[PDB]
Amino acid sequence: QVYNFKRLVFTNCNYNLTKLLSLFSVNDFTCSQISPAAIASNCYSSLIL
Amino acid sequence: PLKYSYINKCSRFLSDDRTEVPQLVNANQYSPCVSIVPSTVWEDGDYYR
Amino acid sequence: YVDVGPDSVKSACIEVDIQQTFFDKTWPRPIDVSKADGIIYPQGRTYSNITITYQGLFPYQGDHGDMYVYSAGHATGTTPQKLFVANYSQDVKQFANGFVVRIGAAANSTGTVIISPSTSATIRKIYPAFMLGSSVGNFSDGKMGRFFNHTLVLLPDGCGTLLRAFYCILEPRSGNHCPAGNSYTSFATYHTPATDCSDGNYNRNASLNSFKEYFNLRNCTFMYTYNITEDEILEWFGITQTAQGVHLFSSRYVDLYGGNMFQFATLPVYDTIKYYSIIPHSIRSIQSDRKAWAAFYVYKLQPLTFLLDFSVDGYIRRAIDCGFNDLSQLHCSYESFDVESGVYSVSSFEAKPSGSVVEQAEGVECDFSPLLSGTPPQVYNFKRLVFTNCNYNLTKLLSLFSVNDFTCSQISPAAIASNCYSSLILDYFSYPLSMKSDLSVSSAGPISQFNYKQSFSNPTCLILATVPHNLTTITKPLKYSYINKCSRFLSDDRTEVPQLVNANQYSPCVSIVPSTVWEDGDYYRKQLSPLEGGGWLVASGSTVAMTEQLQMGFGITVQYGTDTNSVCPKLEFANDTKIASQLGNCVEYSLYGVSGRGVFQNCTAVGVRQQRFVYDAYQNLVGYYSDDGNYYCLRACVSVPVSVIYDKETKTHATLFGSVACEHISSTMSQYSRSTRSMLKRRDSTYGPLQTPVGCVLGLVNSSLFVEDCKLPLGQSLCALPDTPS
Structure with missing residues (x-):
């Protein structure tokens, strides 16, 4: 539920x-302060979902 | 989920029974109100204390 | 969940006796920031022999910390006995952006046994245990420190060589001296040297097993373990928390000798920690073999900046806590650990509210x-x-009657008096x-049926009270009366329909019934017009004899505004300090919503009279006409300028408070510009302030010498000689 988030x-x-993208139909994709292509290609100290 | 649910109030x-303090959720944090709210909302407009 | 293994079989716990007075020791350990004490090394970067500024969470320089000491429990002869521990279990703290600790500080030295100082045993490094979580509260026995939901356990196991971290849920045990059992005193853990920490097989589960005796694990999410080797050299350890989760720091992993802390783990x-406590622990050593342990310290982190x-x-x-004192501030402003000599400007004193x-x-x-005069209406004729x-x-209104019934619905009777509402x-x-048995919103009586009703859409109240002999303007009806029928x-002259009274409304039958009922059982009828569908109004009533003092009832209802609650129990400083004026200090104020801080004084008037607010050409408020008819006026407040003298060659300093004069100067500051004055106090704890032609100073010494150039001149004929060379 919206107040129960998994992280x-x-x-x-x-x-x-993109392997993950194949698993669902995306009906809304918006990224703030970064192009979506870049966030996929960027390397990071952490990634959080 | 049996129903999709959300908290539409948290204060x-x-x-002194005359005033109330609102509690907007902090970035990257669970709302404090989660401690009383059930895992799903049993009925629309349900409230807890 | 995590394979933590089976819980302890027995429900029973070793009894815990609190001996906290034995742990009373004064031994503060301040942070020597110039030695980088407690400094956490920056994330992901390094530097050469250059120096820089830096912002992060660090211990305050003057923080002497908190001290904890672990000791042997009771044992006698060659066998263990009940536990003797401090009241550490009750020490719940507000978690506050992490902390760091100092351990092994007193290692390689000697002290006392503490629980039995009558030994003077040598002391050695011992590792602490901690508990963290988001919620705390009372145990079933009313004891302090109970944690809820999930908790974090930081527990060394057996020897210091093994450290385990756990994230679980704790389940209270119902045995003797156990968290759920009513013989519970205080939770504690213990280690038994007789079998634990064997040289050829250290008991890796020792601490945990004694832990399990008091709590059962119930659903564990995390568990980690660390390999440690013994070393009596002082170590640093710290903990922080970010959106990425909790972070663990230690000097041990990287900087054994310098003490710099690195993110070990x-x-x-990432569950937010709100509370923090330390877990008490005791050694089950033989009485003659009890070993004293080195003192342990804790320091809280703060969002400070450093060189x-x-x-x-x-x-x-080395490091410089910028905000510690004025000198440190100058070092930071010049980004150097060696500032050139001279007089420098420093921040002013804020004064005080x-x-x-x-x-x-x-x-x-x-x-x-x-309400205080004439005859009150019969209950069906109530006035609003x-x-x-x-x-x-x-509550003042109700002191005019003796109250024999004070009740309400959906509001406590006390709360309705103190609550503000859109209406009353x-x-x-x-x-x-x-008739009091018949007066309730829920009553079965004829009063609720036909005379008076209150809505359940609003909080309501009912009051019965009687008139004092000193309310002579109040008069009474010949008899008390009520309607006991209304239909x-x-x-068709056979069917009949009852008319129960409408909430907050007069019964329809009041239109036929007389202002009082002349006799018990009187009844009346009225023919109804064809527009009414015909039929007859019918009503009847009953009476109660008049009494020596009038007896009365009341109804109260309220409406709470969403934002319209204009009716409130305002009092004109009743039971209050009379804040309306001061003669005065630097008081914060509000004047019909105008606000600021300043000194008011009873000065003379300027016009226009009764316009209240006098203003400057820059729109600064200048003064005010009070509604007590006196003009007062406002100077806002002032701050005390400060500067310091720095003698770099002797590495000493002295200060100037500007033009303030020593009438307002004191040994410590109540205002204040900085957290300390102690650097001045290093010599000036023994001396009074001195007046000068510029103004009051500290530590300046009147030598009355005549010198051509001090290189530290204060202006005027004033000068500031350096202390003579070595």
């Missing part, structure tokens, strides 16, 4: 987010 |  | 005087007064006390 902290690991 | 009554 | 737990002296090896060796002063219109007064936008004191409404009528006969 995943990601460190030390490799990803390919 | 604390002042001990 | 991190936790997936950092980095070594070419990248280690922080006083009790507030507020003026606003008073006396509006919610009407309530009609509506009040909005006005000031009241119902009062109904009043004569009412004998003999309309249907036009």
